[PDB]
From a paper:
Aurora A, a Ser/Thr kinase, is a key regulator of mitotic events, including mitotic entry, centrosome maturation, and spindle formation. Aurora A depletion leads to cell cycle arrest, while overexpression has been found in many cancer cell lines. TPX2 recruits Aurora A to the spindle microtubules, an event that is essential in spindle formation. Here we investigate two fundamentally distinct regulation mechanisms by characterizing autophosphorylation of Aurora A as well as activation by TPX2 (Targeting Protein for Xklp2).
Comparison of dephosphorylated Aurora A in the absence or presence of TPX2 reveals subtle but significant interactions by which TPX2 stabilizes the active form of the kinase. First, binding of TPX2 causes a slight rotation of the αC-helix towards the catalytic center, thus allowing for the conserved, stabilizing E181-K162 ion pair to form. Second, movement of F275 initiates a cascade of side chain interactions that result in the completion of the regulatory spine originating from the αF-helix (R-spine). From these structural features it appears that Aurora A, despite being dephosphorylated, is in an active conformation when bound to TPX2. Curiously, the last two hallmarks of the active state are created by a swap of the activation segments of Aurora A resulting in a dimer conformation that has not been previously reported for this protein. In contrast we find an asymmetric dimer within the unit cell with monomer I showing complete electron density for the activation segment while monomer II is missing residues 283–288 (red and blue, respectively). In addition, only monomer I has the perfect geometry of the conserved hydrogen bond network found in a catalytically prone kinase between residues D256, K258, and T292. Therefore we speculated that monomer I may be the enzyme molecule recognizing monomer II as its substrate.
Author numbering:
A (entry chain E): 4 to 20
B (entry chain B): 6 to 22
C (entry chain A): 125 to 388
D (entry chain D): 125 to 282, 289 to 390
Amino acid sequence: VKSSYSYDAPSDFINFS
Amino acid sequence: SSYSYDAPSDFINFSSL
Amino acid sequence: KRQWALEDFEIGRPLGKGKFGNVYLAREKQSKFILALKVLFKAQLEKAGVEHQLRREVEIQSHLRHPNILRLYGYFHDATRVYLILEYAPLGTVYRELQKLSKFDEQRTATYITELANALSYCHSKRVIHRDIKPENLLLGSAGELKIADFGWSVHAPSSRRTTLCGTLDYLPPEMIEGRMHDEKVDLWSLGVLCYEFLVGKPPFEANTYQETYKRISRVEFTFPDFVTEGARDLISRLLKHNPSQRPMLREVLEHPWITANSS
Amino acid sequence: KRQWALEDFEIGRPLGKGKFGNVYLAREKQSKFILALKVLFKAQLEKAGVEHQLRREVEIQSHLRHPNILRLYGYFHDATRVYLILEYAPLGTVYRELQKLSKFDEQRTATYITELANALSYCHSKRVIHRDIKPENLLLGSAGELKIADFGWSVHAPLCGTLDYLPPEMIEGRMHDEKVDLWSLGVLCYEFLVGKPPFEANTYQETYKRISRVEFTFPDFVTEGARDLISRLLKHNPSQRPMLREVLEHPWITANSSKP
Ligand SMILES: Nc1ncnc2c1ncn2[C@@H]1O[C@H](COP(=O)(O)OP(=O)(O)CP(=O)(O)O)[C@@H](O)[C@H]1O
Ligand SMILES: Nc1ncnc2c1ncn2[C@@H]1O[C@H](COP(=O)(O)OP(=O)(O)CP(=O)(O)O)[C@@H](O)[C@H]1O
C-alpha cells in the first residue's frame, strides 16, 4: 500500500469571479 | 466523506501465509 | 478477487453493540474462516463528526501485527455502511471477566500485564502511542491471551522528534514541549492503573464526581488494600508517578521481579 | 464535477523552495486569476512518511475562509506530484519585515496582534487549534494585511466517562487546548516589539528551561501596558491566560492598532 492521496478537500474546478 | 483510507481493501486468501 | 464485498461473508450472531453500529460474527465464504465484521453507519458517523477519527483508527490498527494486538484485516464500505474485518476474539472482554471474578489473582494479573507491555513495546517500536486503555478494550483470544483492540485515541508519533521540536522551541508553550517529550510515557500510567484494577477490582482513583477523581489523579491520591503484596505495590507505585519522566520503561516492567515471578 | 488539471495553469516564476517541493506563481488560464501553486513530490513525502501530516494540513486549511488566513482553494495530484492551489501573498513574510526593521512600533504590533486574534477566534469557532506560529509562517497580502499560512501542527478539536484511566498530563493541558494559541500570541507580541523571542538563548537547553520556569525580562522601552498584555499571555498554567476577546478589548491594543 502506497497512499491514494484522497483527501476530504476540494478538488473541483472553480470559476474565478 | 469519501471513505478512502490508506488501509487494506483487498481480498485475502486466508488459507495462505 | 481484488476488493472485498459484503457478499464474501456469511454472517452469524451479533457479538455486541457499539456506539455506531453492531459487531457480527462472520465467515469468509471461499475459505470458511471465522472473523468479526464490524459495521459502522455512515449517517451516525457524519452526524457525530468522527470520520477522521475512524480513519486514524483503521489506518493505525491495520498496520500492527502482534499476537496481543487485534488484527484488522481490511475495510470496505457500501452506500450506507462502513465494514471492518477483524480477528475474532472468542472469550470476551477483560471487563466482563473482571466483573465475574471480581478481581484476579496475581498470576493472571502479571500475565496480562506482560502481555500488555509486550503489545505496547511493539506499538512504540513502530512509533505508535496507544492512549486510552480500559478493560472494555481488552479482548481475549482462544488460549486466554489479551488482545488490545481500540486505538480510538491512538496517534502516530511524529518522527525526528528531537529535530522537529528543536527549532520551533522558542514558540511553543510548556504544555506542548512536555506533551511531545514524553507522550510515549502515557502508556506506562495506563499499565499502572490497570494492574491496580486487576488486583483490586476497581481503579485507584474512583470517586463520586468527575471533579474528585480529577483531583485524586492530579495529586496521585491512592492507597492499596491490605492483601496487595510488596512486589505489586512496588510496581504500581513506580508506574503511577505524577511526572511522566520518572515512570520506568517497558523494558523495566518486563524485567521487574514481581512480574517475572508470577508471569506464566 | 469538472476537476483540476496541471494544464489549467500558466506556471510562472518560483516564489520559494520549501522542504518537499516548490511554490510557483501561476495564473488560471481561463479566468486569468493570479494565484500560487505549491508542488510537492510524492516520492519525498512517502520517504519522510509525512503524507498524513500533509493530508491533515490540507483538509484543515481548505475549510477555512477568513481574510487573515491564507486561502487554499483546492488540490490535485498527478502520478508523481501533489499540487496545492493557494492564495498569493505578494509582500513576503513577517520574518523578512522584522529583520529589515529590527523591531516594530506599538502601532504595527497591536495591529498584527489584532489580525492574529481574529483569525484565531475564527479557527477556534471551527474547533481548530493552530498551535505553533512562527513569523516565518505569517505572510503579508498586498495591503500588508496579515495571513496565517502554515498548519502543520494544527489539530481538529473534539471526551470522558473515561478519566479513571487518564494520566494527569492528558487530563490537563488537554481540555485547556485553546490556551495553547494564547501563548503563541504572547511570544509574537514580545518578538515584534523587542526584535527576538523572550526565551531565546545560546543553547536549546537554556531556552527550554526558561520556557518552563517562565523566566524572561523586558527591555526598558517596552511600555507598562504592553507588559501587562504580554504577561497575562505568558502564564505557566493555561487556565490563567485570557481569552481572545480580552486580547481584542485590551486597552493597549485598541490604543495602538491602525485599524480594528
Ligand atoms: N473482534 C471481536 N471479537 C469478539 N467480540 C467483539 C469484537 N469486537 C467487538 N466485540 C464485542 O462487541 C462489543 C462492541 O464492540 P466495540 O467495543 O468494538 O464497539 P465500540 O468501539 O463502538 C464500543 P466503545 O463505545 O467502548 O468504543 C464489545 O464490547 C465486544 O464484546
Ligand atoms: N501563497 C504564497 N504566496 C507567496 N509566497 C509564498 C506562498 N507560499 C509560500 N511562499 C514563499 O515560498 C516559500 C515556500 O514556503 P512553504 O510554505 O513551501 O514552506 P514549507 O512549510 O513547505 C517548508 P518550511 O516549513 O521549512 O518553510 C515560503 O518561504 C515563502 O517565502
